[PDB]
């Protein structure tokens with residue numbers, strides 16, 4: 001069994017490299033962030049540009065949605081995060097504390113907390129309602145490349161160019177596990193069931209780990225990833241797929257269990273820096289760097 005993803009829309013508008021794309025939890029919207037300091041909102045099913053959200057002073061590396069699809073958080077080189085009301089475009093809060101670029105961000109499932117990681121090598125946990133920093137974790141010894149809450153928010157996983165992945169107890173901020181040769185870890189996230197973590201390293205390798213056992217369950221290879229923080233995803237709506245961008249301008253799709261490449265999506269004209277999987281439909285969003293600057297939407301039958 002193989003997917004048959006086909007190009008449906010090319011979304012243009014960002015004026016610099018795109019950095020991240022995320023589908024709203026209710027499936028209705030795609031949000032994109034860019035080095036052009038802008039967030040853009042697009043319709044997930046017709047590709048129609050909806051709006052631009054501006055306010056950050058420098059480029060944006062990441063955006064994430066609240067669970068009710070009403071709020072966005074953005075992480076910027078201006079050392080802040082911003083909480084936005086998607087409906088109004090208004091900045092509700094500016095999260096200040098990091099001493100250097102904020103690279104990654106995420107709400108917890110409750111969406112009362114935000115987790116952030118920064119070039120300043122720290123992970124921060126923030127109160128959505130007040131905008132106050134609740135905890136600062138001395139998480140890593142190099143820039144933090146990704147932060148992600150597990151299925152119920154009990155745990156955070158972080159990745160860093162220092163070569164480490166770490167599991168943190170959200171409530172206490174204590175490091176429960178450190179996964180340890182150490183190529184830079186450019187991305188990480190929890191699996192759908194919360195038992196595994198998917199980590200990308202800058203040696204063209206994706207790895208599925210049982211972090212409790214410290215055992216590598218799966219390895220996915222064949223793509224190019226030696227430089228950039230490139231998101232990876234679990235595709236849960238049809239076939240069980242792993243999806244990632246690549247520095248050879250392609251979208252790679254692997255069979256979760258067999259690790260075989262089942263599809264490569266051709267079309268972008270620069271590094272595919274970010275991919276996202278729609279929560280209910282077999283739809284992928286892909287986004288590329290500044291020779292391209294577009295987002296593409298792809299649809300599969302399975």
Ligand SMILES: CS(=O)(=O)c1cc(NS(=O)(=O)c2cc(Br)ccc2O)cc(S(F)(F)(F)(F)F)c1
Nearest residue numbers: 191192193196217218234235236240241256257
């Ligand atoms: C038995 S299975 O085929 O259902 C299976 C489920 C998981 N669980 S998971 O990664 O969280 C996950 C991924 C995706 Br995509 C969709 C749903 C989902 O639950 C992991 C594996 S493994 F990859 F660990 F054993 F090596 F093959 C196998």
